[PDB]
Amino acid sequence: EYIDQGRNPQLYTKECLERALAKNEQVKGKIDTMKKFKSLLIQELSKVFPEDMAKYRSIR
Amino acid sequence: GPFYLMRELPGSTELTGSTNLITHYNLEQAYNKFCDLPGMIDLPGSHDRSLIEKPPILSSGTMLAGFRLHTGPL
Amino acid sequence: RKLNMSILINFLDLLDILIRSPGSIKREEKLEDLKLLFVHVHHLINEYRPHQARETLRVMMEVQKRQRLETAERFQKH
């Protein structure tokens, strides 16, 4: 159906590349947000049990 | 001492969705290129039942033939 | 006291075991494992109630004696 209208596939490949890049960017965004949320919750409650945090940091 | 039901976490960085999947999959230079061919086609010819051809493609005796049919010049 | 750290650490281990291995099967056993842990806390906590129930019984026996004495003394006074 893309050939039916009549257009070179270079524009379609550009659109596929840009939409895949957008999906990659939003996946990177969600990944870094959950990572920073994990880091802030870890450092926020470092005082509840120091031994538990020490074991968590050692095991990682 | 040990907590109940601790286990081993997986290998530190295996294949994830956090890597750059395109650059790992060797597709970078095509994107850096990319980011009408009818027109490309148009340059070769003139312009670009086009209703009929699509329908035919939707579903998906050369010498003797010439001798059989004769078309008046005028 | 021990169970609480384990569920919490697992919660934190389940958070990043998704990124370390998304296609691995062990994530649903961890949820199940989490479910098993949930089954345990409630099961262990329910242990206290029977003992608690027994305590409620003693006051009823105890309060009447505290009430009966007052009635007898009041009657005597009257």
Three-class HEC string of chain C: CHHHHHHHHHHHHHHHHHHHCCCCCHHHHHHHHHHHHHHHHHHHHCCHHHHHHHHHHHHHHHHHHHHHHHHHHHHHHC
Residue C9 with chain A: CB contacts under 8 Å: 52, 56
Handedness of CA B20, B23, B26, B30 (dihedral sign): positive
Largest Cα separation within chain C, whole Å, is: 85
Closest by Cα among C8, A29, C61, C75 to B17: A29
Across the interface, whether the CB atoms of B36 and A11 are under 8 A apart is answered yes
Among the partner residues A34, A38, A56, nearest to C9 by beta-carbon distance: A56
How many angstroms away from the CA of B14 is the closest CA of chain A?
16
Q: How was this structure determined?
A: cryo-EM
The first and second tokens of residue B9, run together, are 């976490």
Residue C12 with chain A: CB contacts under 8 Å: 38, 42, 56
Selected residue of C8, C10, C11, C17 to mutate for chain A interface (largest A Cβ count, 10 A): C8
| Centroid of chain to Cα C46 | 5
Contacting chains of B (3 CB pairs or more, <8 Å) are A, C
- Resolution of the coordinates, Å: 3.7
Name residue, tokens 């538990």. Answer: A52
DSSP state of B46: S
Return contacts of C15-20, CB within 8 angstroms, 24+ apart. Answer: C15/A34, C15/A38, C16/A38, C16/B9, C17/B9, C17/B10, C19/A31, C19/B16, C19/B18, C20/B9, C20/B10, C20/B11, C20/B12, C20/B14, C20/B16
Nearest-by-CA chain C residue for A60: C13
- Position C25, amino acid: I
Report whether C19 contacts A33 (CB < 8 A): no
